Design a protein around this nucleic acid. Structure first.
Lengths: 475, 48
DNA sequence: CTGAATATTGTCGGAACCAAGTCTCCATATGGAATTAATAA
DNA sequence: TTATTAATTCCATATGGAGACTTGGTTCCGACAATATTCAG
């Protein structure tokens, strides 16, 4: 760890005479002609607004605000106050609400390192109320300049005054009033304005345009799979909401082989019967399976010194292994080679939530190093003449595999529902001809590749939007 | 107790010969959402 | 008749913290292997 | 005339655990100022 050395006098920096390590990691003699909170901003005391009842107002907690300074408020109305959102209305009635005045900045008080600072823009409409967990400041200088100087720069001095105290690392208005902002950093940004606002505005509107067409990695798989097979997605989500199945005693042993009569199995049967009403290409998977080798999960330390190991978070709805190992072991089992990922392998997740169990992916990434797949991965070397593994993985990630594994995953603990080899061998999935399987794969490969390219341009723009600020400040 | 059988082939015909309806249903919300800081009301799918 | 001190009225400040989301090593059969084995020409 | 079991070892493997670690931020009690009070010199 760090080894510093400070003096007694340095305990006089704050009237709270704190002497914690985190606060004084930043404390040091200063030569820059620092500014203070008086010149830059002004803390605005919070007040409880008089909300009307007819108009549905919009509320936002800390969790609704994103890391990149976006708000996703919840539309609440006193007219429809049910028990699901009763807690929010309880907070509102208690008095944890305030309407930000236009142009202010709202810094979150809890956990500053997430950089959850939001700016109320001077333009636009439909103002949104916020939880008093934020802190209002009125920037005497240009609001956008202070906003960008607080998000990108000064992100470590704000994090150097947070108070943990047997729990949440939180801030206080006094902590902000204690900050020691520099002069050159702020005056360089303020003087070089009228272009450092135009460039950032253009880049932000480009980012907004890119986000305007973004789609999730699951809807794309759902869209094309719904395009084929002529599946009414609206009716499927309606039959899934039914909570009443009345089967008979005779229809318990049909294709059971182990006498399972739980409600989940009996609703699986109904859903699978509904899904295949018009599709006639279905054959059991157990025919086209050659092996079901599991993985190896030794005791692993995060960021250790040894062979890397994958995790359940590296399987995405796309169908490609993320190959982003985090955990590392140093233990051997005399059979290391059999538990190393190879190009073309088909891995299915074994053990997750009821909605994320059974996700499959093909490696499709040439990596020369050896990476262990945990025992929560089932590798499925199969017959490469009818299945076309990519198609199988993307079928499993689709609603055709997200509903079967949602109701066949055995387990007492619903948080780690697991699938066994028997479910894989007894799964009746639709197999179209090899030519027909290739067409879908091309579609939900090109569309998702375009989506990923969208996901890459936005990151590059958001990185240069702060590189510009850094180079402007330090100049 | 079973008699040197697989009990599946036997159980199929046993259930075929004698049959009775069975009732199954699922509740999603029970109405007593508890946390380490007390209870809280919720919709109750079981009874009203 | 100028109090300040107790009925309390609504607001800060913390918390042997704690829900939300979702990712895990390991004890325990187990059976198909091995083994012993008894079939029987 | 042997070599089939079927028991007794023994393996790496499949299965499952009234789980359990990670990350983020939430309620609620306790002060507490400021209501009020409050009787009195």
């Amino acid at each position: 760890g760090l080894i510093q050395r400070r003096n007694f006098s340095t305990f006089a920096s704050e009237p709270s005479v704190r002497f914690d390590f985190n606060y004084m990691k930043s404390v040091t003699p200063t030569t820059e002609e620092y500014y203070t909170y008086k010149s830059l901003f002004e803390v605005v005391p919070s007040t409880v607004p008089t909300l009307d009842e007819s108009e549905p107002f919009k509320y936002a907690e800390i969790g609704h605000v994103s890391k990149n300074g976006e708000v996703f408020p919840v539309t609440l109305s006193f007219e429809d106050r049910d028990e699901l959102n009763e807690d929010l209305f309880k907070k509102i009635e208690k008095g944890d609400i305030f309407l930000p005045e236009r142009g202010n900045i709202l810094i979150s008080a809890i956990r500053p390192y997430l950089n959850k600072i939001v700016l109320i823009k001077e333009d636009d409409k439909t103002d949104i109320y916020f939880t008093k967990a934020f802190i209002q400041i009125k920037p005497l200088i240009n609001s956008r300049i202070l906003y960008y100087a607080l998000r990108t720069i000064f992100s470590e001095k704000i994090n150097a005054v947070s108070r943990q105290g047997k729990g949440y690392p939180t801030l206080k208005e006094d902590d902000l009033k204690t900050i020691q902002f520099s002069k050159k950093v702020i005056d360089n940004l303020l003087a070089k304005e009228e272009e450092l606002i135009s460039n950032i505005d253009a880049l932000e509107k480009d980012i907004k345009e890119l986000k305007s067409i973004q789609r999730s990695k699951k809807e794309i798989v759902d869209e094309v799979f719904s395009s084929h097979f002529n599946i009414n997605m609206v009716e499927l989500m309606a039959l899934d909401s039914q909570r009443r199945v009345d089967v008979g005693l005779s229809s318990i042993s049909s294709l059971n082989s182990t006498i399972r009569y739980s409600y989940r199995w009996n609703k699986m049967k109904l859903i699978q019967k509904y899904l295949y009403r018009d599709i006639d290409c279905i054959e059991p998977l157990g025919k086209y399976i050659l092996s079901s080798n599991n993985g190896w999960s030794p005791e692993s330390v995060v960021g250790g010194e040894g062979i890397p190991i994958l995790g359940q978070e590296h399987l995405e709805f796309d169908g490609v292994l993320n190959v982003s190992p985090t955990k590392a072991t140093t233990k051997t089992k005399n059979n290391m080679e059999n538990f190393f990922i190879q190009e073309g392998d088909l891995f299915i997740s074994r053990g997750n939530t009821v909605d994320l169990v059974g996700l499959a992916c093909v490696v499709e990434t040439e990596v020369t190093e050896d990476i262990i797949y945990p025992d929560l991965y089932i590798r499925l070397k199969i017959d490469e003449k009818v299945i076309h593994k990519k198609y199988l993985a993307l079928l499993f990630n689709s609603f055709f595999g997200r509903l079967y594994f949602k109701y066949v995953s055995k387990g007492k603990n619903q948080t780690m529902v697991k699938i066994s080899s028997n479910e894989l061998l007894n799964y009746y999935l639709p197999i179209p001809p090899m030519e027909e399987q290739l067409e879908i794969v091309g579609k939900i490969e090109e569309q998702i590749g375009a989506q990923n390219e969208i996901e890459k341009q936005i990151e590059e723009k958001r990185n240069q939007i702060r590189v510009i600020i850094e180079e402007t400040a330090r100049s | 107790v079973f008699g040197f059988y697989n009990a599946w082939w036997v159980f199929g015909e046993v259930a075929k010969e004698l049959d009775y309806p069975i009732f199954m249903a699922e509740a999603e919300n029970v109405g007593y959402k508890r946390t380490k800081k007390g209870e809280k009301p919720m919709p109750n799918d079981l009874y009203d």
